[PDB]
């Protein structure tokens, strides 16, 4: 196997990202990042394929006032792919997942980052197109 590679973070905690799924949630307000030790005044950030948690702002009402685990699949901050190519997308997007990683919807809209894909096989199986 092999663990992931460090990438440009570019997605701090205060950010607002959209859902690329069929669960009906639209907005996603990052709440924290799983596995970040932290630092002084350094607000933790996310990147593609990071297990984070976020709250939904706009979407289905019963789903709003809760904290859900999430993973990040899109971003408009670039990062080198260790092969000299820099990739970024239109928007920063993520898909709401349960704790273990099974994304709770059934479809993903738009493309996904390959690092996110092979980090999370379930979403890769569901991912529309890989990139």
């Amino acid at each position: 196997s092999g663990a992931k590679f460090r990438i440009s973070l570019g997605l701090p905690v205060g950010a607002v990202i959209n859902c690329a799924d069929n669960t009906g949630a639209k907005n996603l307000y990052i709440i924290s990042v799983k596995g970040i030790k932290g630092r002084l005044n350094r607000l933790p950030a996310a990147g593609v394929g990071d297990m984070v948690m976020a709250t939904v702002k706009k979407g289905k009402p019963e789903l709003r006032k809760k904290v859900h685990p999430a993973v990040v699949i899109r971003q408009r901050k670039s990062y080198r792919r260790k092969d000299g190519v820099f990739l970024y997308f239109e928007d920063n997007a993520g898909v709401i997942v349960n704790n273990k990683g099974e994304m709770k919807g059934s479809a993903i809209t738009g493309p996904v980052a390959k690092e996110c894909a092979d980090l999370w096989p379930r979403i890769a199986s569901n991912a529309g197109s890989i990139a």
């Binding site: 899109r74 092969d83 970024y88 997308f89 493309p111 990139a131």
Partner: protein, 118 residues
């Protein structure tokens, strides 16, 4: 081992340069430098910018072998290349004997029929 081509400027990008663009629709793009991607995000027609290669191609600033194969050599069941050749080349005044023999045989049968009916 892949050398990409710029999605706007149409240039062979070498591995150490450029960036990628992935579109929410699914489309992917590659740009050479900041200039190219800024033009692209400006939705400018590259065939209008004066140094994009496709523009020159449109404006003509720069600058098939149909080889045939007619073969028939296969043999046919109940015969072979020799047998088909032999029965194809009785041209030198051998067909006629079989020809007239069949015609006369047909003529003899019709006279036989003439006798049978009358």
């Amino acid at each position: 081992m892949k050398v990409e081509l710029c999605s706007f400027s149409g240039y062979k990008i070498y591995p150490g340069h450029g960036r990628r663009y992935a579109r929410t629709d699914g489309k992917v793009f590659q740009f050479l430098n900041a200039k190219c991607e800024s033009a692209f995000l400006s939705k400018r027609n590259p065939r209008q910018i004066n140094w994009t290669v496709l523009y020159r191609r449109k404006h003509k600033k720069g600058q098939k072998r149909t080889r045939r194969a007619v073969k028939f050599q296969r043999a046919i069941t109940g015969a072979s290349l020799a047998d088909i050749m032999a029965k194809r080349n009785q041209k030198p005044e051998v067909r006629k004997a079989q020809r007239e023999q069949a015609i006369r045989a047909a003529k003899e049968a019709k006279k036989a029929k003439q006798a049978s009916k009358k």
